[PDB]
């Protein structure tokens, strides 16, 4: 639903997550942004694991 | 500079790219958003190269 999505975005600070990812993207301006986004989230996943 | 960032974002369709990933994110609503986005972009990456 649309309300479930809005809720999810708020509860999990998705907006701030995008902001941080864009900040990174603009610092790096990678040849390959998908590869870069992959590594960026991989790094953050590892933080939230240990 | 800021202008180089705006330019990069437009040139590389960054906005739609990110938006598409969040739309998927909103459908799945995973307990682990980071892991999901990681897997999401890993998939798009593999077709980037």
């Amino acid at each position: 639903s649309l309300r479930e999505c809005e809720l999810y975005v708020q509860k999990h600070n998705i907006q701030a997550l995008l902001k941080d990812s864009i900040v990174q993207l603009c610092t790096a301006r990678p040849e390959r942004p998908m590869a870069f986004l992959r590594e960026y989230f991989e790094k953050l996943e590892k933080e939230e694991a240990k | 500079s800021l202008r180089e960032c705006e330019l990069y974002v437009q040139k590389h369709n960054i906005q739609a790219l990110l938006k598409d990933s969040i739309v998927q994110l909103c459908t799945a609503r995973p307990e682990r958003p980071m892991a999901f986005l990681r897997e999401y972009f890993e998939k798009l990456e593999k077709e980037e190269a």
Binding site: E6, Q15, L18, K19, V23, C26 | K19, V23, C26
Partner: peptide, 27 residues
């Protein structure tokens, strides 16, 4: 630097809008 982050916020809020829109079109 603050210029950057300010711009990142603007863009992120843009994406969040387009996401909500696309989420009304689907259900």
């Amino acid at each position: 630097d603050e210029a950057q982050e300010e711009l990142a916020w603007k863009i992120a809020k843009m994406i969040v809008s387009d996401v909500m829109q696309q989420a009304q079109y689907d259900q």
